[PDB]
Amino acid sequence: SICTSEEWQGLMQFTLPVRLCKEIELFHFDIGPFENMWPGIFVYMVHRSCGTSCFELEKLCRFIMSVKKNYRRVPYHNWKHAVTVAHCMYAILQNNHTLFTDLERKGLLIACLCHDLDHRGFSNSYLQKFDHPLAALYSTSTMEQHHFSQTVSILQLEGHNIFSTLSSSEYEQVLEIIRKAIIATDLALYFGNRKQLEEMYQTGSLNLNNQSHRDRVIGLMMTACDLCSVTKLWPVTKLTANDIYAEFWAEGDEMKKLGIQPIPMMDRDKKDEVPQGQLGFYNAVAIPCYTTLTQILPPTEPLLKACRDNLSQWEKVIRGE
């Protein structure tokens, strides 16, 4: 997928409505109601965080419109999710201004937009269990290796390599940041990452000039952004939930077409247990993520608070309220 001459020139015209400017800096901001602004909203966030002279604008608008093209029309892992994850990374880096290099803020905003590129709405287990081509290629973190492969594809396209103008080494530094960040969105790898950071922060040996330590903190940040649907206002959070299950149930529907019972999270015949499942996901995954994050990055506390507020709302739904 390469964007036409027709698409990206309109993106160079876009100026963000000034009434938002302040509301976009909030952690809990929702990009939902501004669909035709999401491509330019990403341009805005790149210019604010990295400077307008960071990328040359012609190359940048092409890359954003091609990446958008390569997102399938699935309920949840779509173009809206990519810009929602990218905004959370924007808010984290804006509130941790003096912690990350220019190169890291470049890659991470790029990595978040492309972290789910060409998602087909299926979990890694589905591709591996039922012998998908990509699973025969990428044995572990199947889609995550595909997501990074899809990004490198677009970057190698003509007029798209926004990283054309870095040092030849500096560029190979960016791709490692982008790869490790996208690989870190594999939720299965999150538990080892967050437990390692737990012991490290606790023992005090968490060293922020240790590169592998930096990559672990980046990975937790990628997880925090990937889950940021739990950190919006409860009206927004409850709505994104409907998108998540519609895609889960669709994968489980394919599981039934054989003759197998999917896990209850992917069974539409078990919608009643959804509020309990959310309460369990927040306590087992979400709360640990943003708690270790806030411990490492104190400015990211609004995420932890918003996640706690959303957790009590699910508890009220379970408790008959």
Ligand X SMILES: CCOC(=O)c1c(C2CN(c3cc(C(=O)CNCN(CC)CC)c4ccccc4n3)C2)nc2ccccn12
Given 226, 247, 251, 267, the residue binding Zn ion (CB under 5 A): 226
Residue 278 labeled ligand binder = yes
Site residues for Zn ion, 100-129, by CB under 5 A, read: 116
DSSP state string for 22-86: HHHTSTT---TT-GGGHHHHHHHHHHHHH-TTSS-HHHHHHHHHHHHHTS---SSSSHHHHHHHH
Distance CA 119, CA 265 (A): 19
Is 28 an active-site residue? no
CB of 81 to Mg ion, least distance (A): 9
Per rule CB under 5 A, count of chain residues that contact Zn ion: 2
Residues lying near ligand X in the complex (CB under 6 A): 187, 227, 229-230, 241, 244, 263-265, 270, 273-274, 277-278, 280-281, 284
CB of 235 to ligand X, least distance (A): 7
Residues lying near a copy of itself in the complex (CB under 8 A): 19, 23, 28, 30, 32-36, 233-236, 238-239, 276-277, 279-280, 282-284, 287, 291, 308, 311-312, 315, 318-319
152 token code pair: 């490198």
185 binds, among ligand X, a copy of itself, Mg ion, none (CB under 5 to 8 A by kind): Mg ion
Active site residue: 77, 87, 146, 147, which one? Answer: 77
DSSP H stretches of helix in the chain: 5-12, 21-24, 38-50, 57-69, 79-95, 102-114, 124-129, 133-137, 142-155, 168-183, 187-203, 211-226, 234-258, 274-281, 287-296, 301-318
Beta carbons of 110 and 178 less than 8 angstroms apart? yes
CB of 71 to Mg ion, least distance (A): 12
**Cβ contacts of residue 205 below 8 Å, gap of 6+?**
none
CB of 311 to a copy of itself, least distance (A): 6
Q: Which residues contribute to the site for Zn ion (CB under 5 A)?
A: 116, 226
Hey, which residues are catalytic here? 77
